[PDB]
């Protein structure tokens, strides 16, 4: 029988969790919250690799959510007295959801969720794994990792190599290998999954040599390792911005890192506040080479993967949160050329390419509303769709890739945002978790409940077998030379060669015009 207050072993000592959802489910869920997977990255461990967590005597309380990593709460709120929730540099914790029948040796598949938030916001407690664990009989782990300046500050040299947050994620995955059997998970059957910066994180583990053997499958929702804003060949803009805001100017790398280690949490938060996103670098430990080189390597051996995108990734929430929404509403045929020259610069293209962008996405269009929708379409393709299609192409010659486009505009958002918005950024997450953030219930239509049951079963079948297919689910073909992908909506359908024209434009036509 499941205990009300179950006690489990870890390498660092015993922990007590909770039994929940006994009434509204068959046989309930065990939660174990706030488990340390690394030593707190404070004092000299700020801008240093994660180190082994300390052992304890007695039974650790696993009934409270951990502190979130330091982040800008205004931005997290744009994405509720979040000021009452604990926030600390001491934030390297993970949460576990298990079916209440699980014990040492149950050998259930494990799914490890890596949250998004552009590597500057988010927390594990936002994602309640309870319904995924009970509906699909698996262990769900939600992890934290250092965010913003504390996660991704680099000097480009030995004093701060960078990618602290990715090293944290790998430390959490090593904890899962070491400990998950004590909670009834099979460490040989771990799937990493994540959305947006979390998808980028997952895709980054898929290429990182020191992450190999920490997982057996990968699910990348609306983000991969080539998401342009989250990967950089230079450390220079971030480090010079941080030196200026911190008052640690006119210092070498060694003195800059020493100066930044003396800063309080409040001083770090004030420096951190300007970053709406922060990139990973080629740090040498996590990425020995740029992800594009690792993906193209003849020695690349990716795990089986699901990779997918939504049909309106830049439709509403990203431009609103990033503060580009006002500029977009200002687009007309009169200023379009100037907007596309500015956009070309942000895309790291020559501003001469603005005419090619205009012809590809806007053509002869005059209507301002249509131009603004074409602009968001272009941004979504550049940031999410083309990178996803490129990574899927690099992987699928080595290992199974199942590709999806999620298309369903959620019923509960119809009155909250413009009616032209289709499946926005993050719209698929509640279909995978069968709940909104913090496990809050949603008024799904009957049709939406079926799409959620299907997506949960595809994901869990993939966690079990590296193949999403099973009886009663529409057949999802593996991605091969026919470029097949599953269109996820109320009536799922198979498509071929998603946005093949756009892929030709971005990967062949546009680089040819640049070469000239
Ligand atoms: N939410 C995210 O992780 C995100 C949003 C925009 C850009 N990159 C990442
Ligand atoms: N129509 C709008 O208000 C809008 C908001 C955000 C992005 N694009 C358009
Ligand atoms: Cl510790």
Residue numbers in the entry: 29 to 107, 114 to 550
Question: Can you provide the manuscript's text about this entry?
Answer:
Here, we present the first crystal structure of mCes2c to 2.12 Å resolution. The structure contains four monomers in the asymmetric unit (pairwise RMSD values of 0.15 Å), which are referred to as chains A–D, with the biological assembly being a monomer. In all 4 chains, residues C97-C125 and C282-C293 form disulfide bonds. In each monomer of the experimental structure of mCes2c, additional electron density was observed that could ideally be fitted to one molecule of nicotinamide (NCA) in the substrate binding pockets with 100% occupancy. Analysis of the ligand–protein interaction reveals H-bonding of the NCA-carbonyl oxygen to the backbone amide protons of oxyanion-hole residues G151, A152, and A231. The presence of NCA leads to restricted access to the active site within the core. In mCes2c, the entrance to the substrate binding pocket of each monomer is framed mostly by flexible loops and helical parts of the cap, the RD including the gate residue M417, and parts of the core. Similar to the product release mechanism of hCES1 proposed by Bencharit et al. next to the active site in the site door region, mCes2c harbors the conserved gate (M417) and switch (F418) residues.
Mouse Ces2c (mCes2c) is suggested as potential ortholog of human CES2. Both enzymes, hCES2 and mCes2c, can hydrolyze classical carboxylesterase substrates including acyl-carnitine, they can be inhibited by anti-rat CES antibodies, and they have high activities towards triacylglycerols, diacylglycerols, and monoacylglycerols as substrate. The monomeric unit of mCes2c harbors an α/β-hydrolase fold with additional modules and insertions.
